[PDB]
Amino acid sequence: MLKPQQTTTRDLISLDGLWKFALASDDNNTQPWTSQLKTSLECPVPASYNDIFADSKIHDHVGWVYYQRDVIVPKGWSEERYLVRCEAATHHGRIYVNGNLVADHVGGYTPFEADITDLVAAGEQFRLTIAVDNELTYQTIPPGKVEILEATGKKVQTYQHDFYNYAGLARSVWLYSVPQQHIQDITVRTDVQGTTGLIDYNVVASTTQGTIQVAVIDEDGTTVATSSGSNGTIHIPSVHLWQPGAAYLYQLHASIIDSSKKTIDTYKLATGIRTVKVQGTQFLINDKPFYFTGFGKHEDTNIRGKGHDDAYMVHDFQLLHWMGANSFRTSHYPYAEEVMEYADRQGIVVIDETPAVGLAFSPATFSPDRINNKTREAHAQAIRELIHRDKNHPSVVMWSIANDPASNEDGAREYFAPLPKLARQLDPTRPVTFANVGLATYKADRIADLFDVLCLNRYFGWYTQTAELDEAEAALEEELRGWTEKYDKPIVMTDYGADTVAGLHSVMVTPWSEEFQVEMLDMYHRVFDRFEAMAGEQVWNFADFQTAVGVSRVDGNKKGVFTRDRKPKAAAHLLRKRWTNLH
Amino acid sequence: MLKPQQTTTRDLISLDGLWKFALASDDNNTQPWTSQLKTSLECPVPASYNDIFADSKIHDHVGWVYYQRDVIVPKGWSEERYLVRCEAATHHGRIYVNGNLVADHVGGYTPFEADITDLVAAGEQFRLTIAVDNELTYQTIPPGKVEILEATGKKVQTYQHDFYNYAGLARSVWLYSVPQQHIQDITVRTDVQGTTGLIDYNVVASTTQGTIQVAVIDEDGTTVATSSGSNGTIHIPSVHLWQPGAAYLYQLHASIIDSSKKTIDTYKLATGIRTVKVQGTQFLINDKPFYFTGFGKHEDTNIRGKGHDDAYMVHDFQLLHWMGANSFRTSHYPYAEEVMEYADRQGIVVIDETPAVGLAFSPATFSPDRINNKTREAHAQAIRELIHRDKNHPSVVMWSIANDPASNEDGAREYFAPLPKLARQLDPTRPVTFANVGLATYKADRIADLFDVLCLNRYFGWYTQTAELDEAEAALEEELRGWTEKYDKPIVMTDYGADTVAGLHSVMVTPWSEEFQVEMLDMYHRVFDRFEAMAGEQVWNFADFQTAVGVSRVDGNKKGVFTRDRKPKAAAHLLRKRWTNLH
Numbered sequence A, B: 001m002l003k004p005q006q007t008t009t010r011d012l013i014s015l016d017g018l019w020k021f022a023l024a025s026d027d028n029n030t031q032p033w034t035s036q037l038k039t040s041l042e043c044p045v046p047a048s049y050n051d052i053f054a055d056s057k058i059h060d061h062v063g064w065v066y067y068q069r070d071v072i073v074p075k076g077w078s079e080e081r082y083l084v085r086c087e088a089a090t091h092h093g094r095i096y097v098n099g100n101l102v103a104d105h106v107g108g109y110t111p112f113e114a115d116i117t118d119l120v121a122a123g124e125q126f127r128l129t130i131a132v133d134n135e136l137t138y139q140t141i142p143p144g145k146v147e148i149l150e151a152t153g154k155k156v157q158t159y160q161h162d163f164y165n166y167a168g169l170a171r172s173v174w175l176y177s178v179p180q181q182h183i184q185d186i187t188v189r190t191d192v193q194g195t196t197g198l199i200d201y202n203v204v205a206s207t208t209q210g211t212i213q214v215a216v217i218d219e220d221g222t223t224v225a226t227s228s229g230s231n232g233t234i235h236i237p238s239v240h241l242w243q244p245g246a247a248y249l250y251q252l253h254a255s256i257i258d259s260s261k262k263t264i265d266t267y268k269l270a271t272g273i274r275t276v277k278v279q280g281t282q283f284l285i286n287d288k289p290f291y292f293t294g295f296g297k298h299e300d301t302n303i304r305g306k307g308h309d310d311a312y313m314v315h316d317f318q319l320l321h322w323m324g325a326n327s328f329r330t331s332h333y334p335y336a337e338e339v340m341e342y343a344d345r346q347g348i349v350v351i352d353e354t355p356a357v358g359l360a361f362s363p364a365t366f367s368p369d370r371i372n373n374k375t376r377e378a379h380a381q382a383i384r385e386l387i388h389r390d391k392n393h394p395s396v397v398m399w400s401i402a403n404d405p406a407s408n409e410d411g412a413r414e415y416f417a418p419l420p421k422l423a424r425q426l427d428p429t430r431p432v433t434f435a436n437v438g439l440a441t442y443k444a445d446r447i448a449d450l451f452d453v454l455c456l457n458r459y460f461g462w463y464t465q466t467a468e469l470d471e472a473e474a475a476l477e478e479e480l481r482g483w484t485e486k487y488d489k490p491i492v493m494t495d496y497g498a499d500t501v502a503g504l505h506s507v508m509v510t511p512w513s514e515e516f517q518v519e520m521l522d523m524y525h526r527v528f529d530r531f532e533a534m535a536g537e538q539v540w541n542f543a544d545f546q547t548a549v550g551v552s553r554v555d556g557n558k559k560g561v562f563t564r565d566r567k568p569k570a571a572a573h574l575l576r577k578r579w580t581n582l583h
């Protein structure tokens, strides 16, 4: 259902705070959800659990963990319907109401919930256990594989993506209420015809006893259009368009109305009116060419891992404005909903991406014993959930289906083909892409024609023609010539950068130095400006972030333009110089 | 010839200073050495040239470079014989006297010289040009291979060892004089009978008209013994032995005496009376069991590359005493002669190693198109030169023939077999070893039985069972159990460590972190003390040093226990605690 909010007809209780916490063990205490959890450990809830406790065993845990607390259902919610929702459980979440299992959810970055109305009475207290598993298989969405170390028998988790596999309840948890007759979902699609905006709306409600009313109210509070019935099309004369650096949001009020025109339910949905179209080599927002600038990001901060953080979000956006970035990509999984809402308000453009990284074992990637049909089912599901949650965001401008898949290999085409079709059928208003890895050159890639925009990740400077920028430059523009020659589509570089340690400086060409980072980005830009077909540049990455451990990762990925704590490297100042002065 | 010194009969002029410097190029000036060099560039000589100039083209240069200066032979040197000597030219040096080639030397780390007596008159000035080439082939001592980048034509140098291929005149240059009848070489060998010390000596001198006297003088200037003739045996009653941690050096004056008892030539040779023996599993110095503590090192400092530096030498030795290290290994090439002399006086023990690192392409490494018989000729030459130079140092206790050869492969035994014998045949006073890489396990290695002591380099914690210390413990232990049950020899660990950035800290098990470094060294020690056959532990590395450019090297190699500028990481304090509280 829709993201809960408080209305005149709905109440909303945060369940954030400290919960009791335990790992699964191998004792008789199988089934921790059947009684009061016995632990001194408390884990804060919007957070990944891994780095919270300064304990290796928790950090390295493979398998299930348990969060628990008591909840009291407000006494005045008899006569109403009520749910427990996890905005996200990374990767597999189970909800229990006193020992009854009431939801079982497999994706790691989208919402799930359970209607507990008939299990617990208003004003009753219950024990809420939420079990979350972190295990990845070749069928989970980021896929991976658990192994056992021979000598010690320690379980270990392998996977093919960079960022660390933080787990837990990294986003907030809620108790909320709706009326018996309630709104469940709303879809809004926005076109523009001259100066007139139009909203195609569709409301889905638990009942059609009593009817649906809509009002559309502008930023000044004046009702600018009205409509009746669950589905319809509204015109808005002289619209204020939502624009890439000037957000404008109307506010769509969907209500359920009884025989007496008495409101029995209501929901307020923020709406930006704007259009995305791809025309040849151009990416058009409101019929005008747009050029992405900004980053691929990560949900990653010092202690709470991937947990949502209001402050770092608002700061992160301020830093985007400060350097004149107009966009980012939700690199390698959907971010928290609040980020998308905030982007809507900040006038920031978003490439919104599924959790589908790691579909590459370079052993044939797309085969029965690796990334097969059952993985595609999970991928299809990821696509549906992402789209079902983020479809109404004006800031969301395109769907990214995957990141660095092995789109050069046999089987890749048979695997991906249905997916861009599924997306476009779920949401026909946005174009679809994926992020292409170096191995799938314009010659070798077998999947690119099935997409509306091409996104490329490239590290010519760093990984291959190492510190040889003149060699990287030639190879970069060879590759881009190939792509422009072969496809009539917009090109966005979604990765390009260099690991860089704050304070490490050199007047020579030296990788891992701030000078090198600047020089490489600056070369890439020179090359970008040589190609009419370029529609965007998003540096990798906004900020240093944590990775699986490895002799080649210096306490994480240090390709950030800011440090993990958001201090700017020289690179940051270079981008600021370029993005505040370019078109 | 012997390392030149000033005596009553010999003069010695330093030619260190700034020299004019030029890269070779494709100009109508093939042949720089034939006229005054045209450059504004001056390179200081005891220095590698690569980082001096803050210029990428000089640094990345592949091939020849030219140093030049004017030199004046003293007017008072008529009636004498005189030479120009390079202590070292990395890797291939040529000496030119006004356009005449007079020396052509091929290894990068040993002396060469030319007698110019008849080409330049006393009191004459001449133009001294020394050409030095950096190119590594599969036949050079560190071997390597030059390649050409496809798009640009940049000439580039590949090789298989870590440390950066610094080139140039990294050690001092000299003009010196010797009488017509002179001492060319001395060999001293030292045994003990009870409390009497016995010096076996042999003097090689240019002629025999008039004879050889020898005097042995103690640290007090008291002549303690004498002898006549170009070779013989000197008896020293109640000898002051040379000991690890308590140097004592006698001073052996070889003279040439004419028909009158008038001195014609004299040379003063520092000697320490000491024996080295391997009996089963023990390493014995003066019939007392010995345990190595310290480091593999590198000649490497911030701007002068491999340039010898007195301050860093004295300081580095001071840091060794501070942490109670008693030894180091001349990791990957012979060090400056002056370091060996200083080790003699400091009572520091030395594993002295040839430049033969990188004999490993893991394609078969020991074949005609890789390490082949001509390569083995170069290797044999390197062994001869090293032994010829460092034969008289009591500090030097064992020759290391190579570092990380692929001694697990077919052909490796046929390649190395002659090499231990050659060393033992040139110098029968010391054991011979080599440093064994992880591929070459106790099972797989096929070379180890030809050596007197086994040295192992092992990185279980860092490179293989990464951050998994218990897993590394088990595999380290297994391995060592394999070597001890298979050979009756001393086992010295010569590499073990982890990249560690100063300042990077963590309460968790975190590679590259100061805490991790300590946790790993500490564990390795725990395993060492379980095995009676261990004869030494030498950490890799003493200090952070520069390497070739690469995404897995953070502006060089950071496995130092000290920083490049010699600041202690947490690990330095751990070793200090360990080595000062045990023998």
Ligand SMILES: CC1(C)[C@@H](O[C@H]2O[C@H](C(=O)O)[C@@H](O)[C@H](O)[C@H]2O)CC[C@]2(C)[C@H]3C(=O)C=C4[C@@H]5C[C@@](C)(C(=O)O)CC[C@]5(C)CC[C@@]4(C)[C@]3(C)CC[C@@H]12
Pocket (backbone or CB within 6 Å): A161, A162, A163, A362, A404, A437, A438, A439, A440, A457, A458, A459, A463, A464, A495, A540, A557, A559
């Ligand atoms: C690592 C990935 C998957 C890709 O994404 C990465 O982004 C960031 C990073 O690189 O640091 C991090 O977020 C994280 O590490 C990853 O998600 C970056 C590109 C990537 C490293 C590819 C390459 O860079 C280049 C490769 C070349 C291609 C080719 C044709 C060549 O250049 O000659 C063959 C050789 C080689 C090394 C094959 C591997 C890839 C495709 C590589 C390393 C794969 C992984 C990519």
Ligand SMILES: CC1(C)[C@@H](O[C@H]2O[C@H](C(=O)O)[C@@H](O)[C@H](O)[C@H]2O)CC[C@]2(C)[C@H]3C(=O)C=C4[C@@H]5C[C@@](C)(C(=O)O)CC[C@]5(C)CC[C@@]4(C)[C@]3(C)CC[C@@H]12
Pocket (backbone or CB within 6 Å): B161, B162, B163, B362, B404, B437, B438, B439, B440, B457, B459, B463, B464, B495, B540, B541, B557
């Ligand atoms: C790099 C060397 C030659 C060795 O010496 C180096 O020490 C330091 C360093 O590693 O950075 C520096 O001083 C410098 O770079 C070198 O002198 C260190 C060990 C070394 C890296 C080996 C390993 O660490 C482990 C390897 C494993 C072992 C293997 C084959 C097995 O026996 O089962 C499994 C796979 C692998 C990766 C094969 C390579 C080696 C033997 C490796 C990397 C070889 C190079 C070694």
